[PDB]
């Protein structure tokens, strides 16, 4: 439909405002997450990971998609603040046990049939 129902934020400006508010909320939480969960990472590493997770959705140009993304981000944050998660999930954000997947054509050709 031409007149799509907005979740909120109307245009993209208010969506960006909500994105920045959620980013501030996550940024001020990383020291507490490191302290409580007794993570062995640095605070800088946690902030960098929050920044990277925010940046992987930087190409979104739909206000409704942005609103859903910030809703799910707030959900993830409230999981972390209430210590509902464990160190398991917080470290699952880091993919610490995966082998470095090759990205060049020659290495992909050598390892297997993966495109």
């Amino acid at each position: 439909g031409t007149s799509v129902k907005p979740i909120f934020s109307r245009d993209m400006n208010e969506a960006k405002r909500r994105v920045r508010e959620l980013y501030r909320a996550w940024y001020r939480e990383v020291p507490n997450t490191v302290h409580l969960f007794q993570l062995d990472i640095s605070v800088k590493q946690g902030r960098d990971k929050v920044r990277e997770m925010f940046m992987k959705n930087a190409h979104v140009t739909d206000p409704r998609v942005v609103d859903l993304l910030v809703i799910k981000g707030k959900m993830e944050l409230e999981e972390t603040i209430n210590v509902w998660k464990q160190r398991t999930h917080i470290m699952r954000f880091f993919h610490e046990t995966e082998a470095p997947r090759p990205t060049d054509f020659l290495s992909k050709f050598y390892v297997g049939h993966d495109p």
Binding site: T2, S3, V4, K5, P6, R10, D11, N57, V60, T61, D62, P63, R64, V65, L68, L69, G112, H113, D114, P115
Partner: protein
């Protein structure tokens, strides 16, 4: 009032699929071919969307067929080619569309088996 989004729909960031299986997957939208072993045509009514085939290897123990592709068994049913194309586009996968093949109408006549001067006459019944 009600906002307007003059852009193509895209829910790839919300579906949760990994980027590898979003970018490097080419689905196939088509109407399945009739199973040649049967004359029934009721399985060639709806369009189907299926993914490309990935590697399967042999399990070192018990010799089973292992896999590493999550979307190996994922087949979706769509009533129309347009519906399937829209779904594939909004989910971000590549897609190849194949047009439905319907048999051409044919002229059948029982009396052609006994033609007076044509080769259509049959030598047995």
């Amino acid at each position: 009032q009600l906002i307007a989004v003059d852009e193509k729909l895209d829910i790839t960031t919300l579906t949760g699929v990994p980027e590898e299986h979003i970018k490097t997957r080419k689905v196939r939208i088509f109407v399945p071919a009739r199973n040649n072993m049967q004359s029934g045509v009721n399985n060639t009514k709806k369009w189907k969307m299926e993914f490309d085939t990935r590697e399967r290897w042999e399990n070192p123990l018990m010799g089973w067929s292992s896999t590493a592709d999550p979307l190996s068994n994922l087949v979706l049913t769509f009533s129309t080619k347009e519906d399937a194309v829209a779904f594939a586009e909004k989910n971000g996968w590549s897609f190849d569309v194949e047009e439905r093949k319907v048999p051409k109408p044919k002229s059948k006549s029982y009396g052609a088996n006994f033609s007076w001067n044509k080769r259509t006459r049959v030598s047995t019944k």
